[PDB]
Amino acid sequence: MKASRLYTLVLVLQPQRVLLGMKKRGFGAGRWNGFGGKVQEGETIEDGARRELQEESGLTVDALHKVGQIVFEFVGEPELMDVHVFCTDSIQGTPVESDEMRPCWFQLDQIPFKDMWPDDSYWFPLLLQKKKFHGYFKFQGQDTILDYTLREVDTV
Ligand SMILES: Nc1[nH]c(=O)nc2c1ncn2[C@H]1C[C@H](O)[C@@H](COP(=O)(O)OP(=O)(O)OP(=O)(O)O)O1
Ligand code: NA
Ligand code: NA
């Protein structure tokens, strides 16, 4: 069995658009993603997701709703990424560009799947339908899925 590290991912999803962030620097630059990062000691997962949304995008929110959980496994990495996925309830403020991330709105008929993590093509349609999900994806590198599971659930 493997150890897992906790991460968050937040989708700012409105009726006609979604906010994504383009990673600007380092390895993995050029891909659009939700907002999030590692959970820290002592905070709840939801509070970590709110904190990461603010640090990464400048947006604050009073509350999130949990919509999914996805485990990522990468060839050559023994540690699993356990990603807890949330959708915003309502947002305050404007998103802000940083040196690491550029936020941008996309209409929901222009979701930029080819420039997102490949797994998003599978689970983000469920998120758009207001369904909840559990997933697992094993990657070779950044682009190639070797194995995956995806299941709609009634409780995350
Ligand atoms: N396959 C994938 N599909 C996806 O949609 N999001 C993914 C993904 N793999 C990783 N992510 C997201 C999860 C999380 O929001 C982020 C990874 O977190 P990071 O390692 O950037 O966290 P931190 O910024 O806290 O890390 P530090 O560099 O230690 O500060 O990318
Ligand atoms: Na962090
Ligand atoms: Na991050």
CATH number at residue 6: 3.90.79.10
Separation between Cα atoms, residue 50 and residue 66, nearest integer Å: 12
4 to 49, 74, 99: CA distances (angstroms): 17, 12, 29
Question: Binding site for 8-oxo-ATP: residue ranges?
Answer: 27, 35-38, 52, 56, 117-120
Torsion-angle region of 122 (φ positive above 0: left; ψ -120 to 50: alpha; else: beta): alpha
Tokens of 136: 């697992």
Number of domains observed in the structure of the chain: 1
To what resolution in angstroms was this structure determined?
A: 1.2
Could you give the C-alpha distances from 63 to 42, 66, 120, in angstroms and in order? 18, 10, 23
How was this structure obtained?
Answer: X-ray
Residues contacting 88, CB < 8 A, separation 6+:
10, 11, 12, 13, 53, 59, 61, 64
Report the first-to-last Cα separation within the chain, whole angstroms: 22
CB atoms within 10 A of CB 56: 21
Going by CA atoms, what residue is nearest to atom 19 of ligand 1?
Answer: 37
Tokens of 32: 């659009």
Instruction: Report how far residue 52's alpha carbon sits from residue 143's, in angstroms, rounded to the nearest whole number.
Output: 25
Ligand nearest to the CA of 56: 3
Non-local (6+) Cβ contacts of 34 within 8 A are 9, 10, 11, 12, 20, 21, 85
Closest CA to 9 of 23, 20, 22, 24: 20
Q: Which of 20, 31, 33, 100 to mutate to test the pocket of ligand 1 (most atoms within 8 A of CB)?
A: 33
Parent domain of 41: 1-156
Are the CB atoms for 7 and 40 separated by under 8 Å? Answer: no
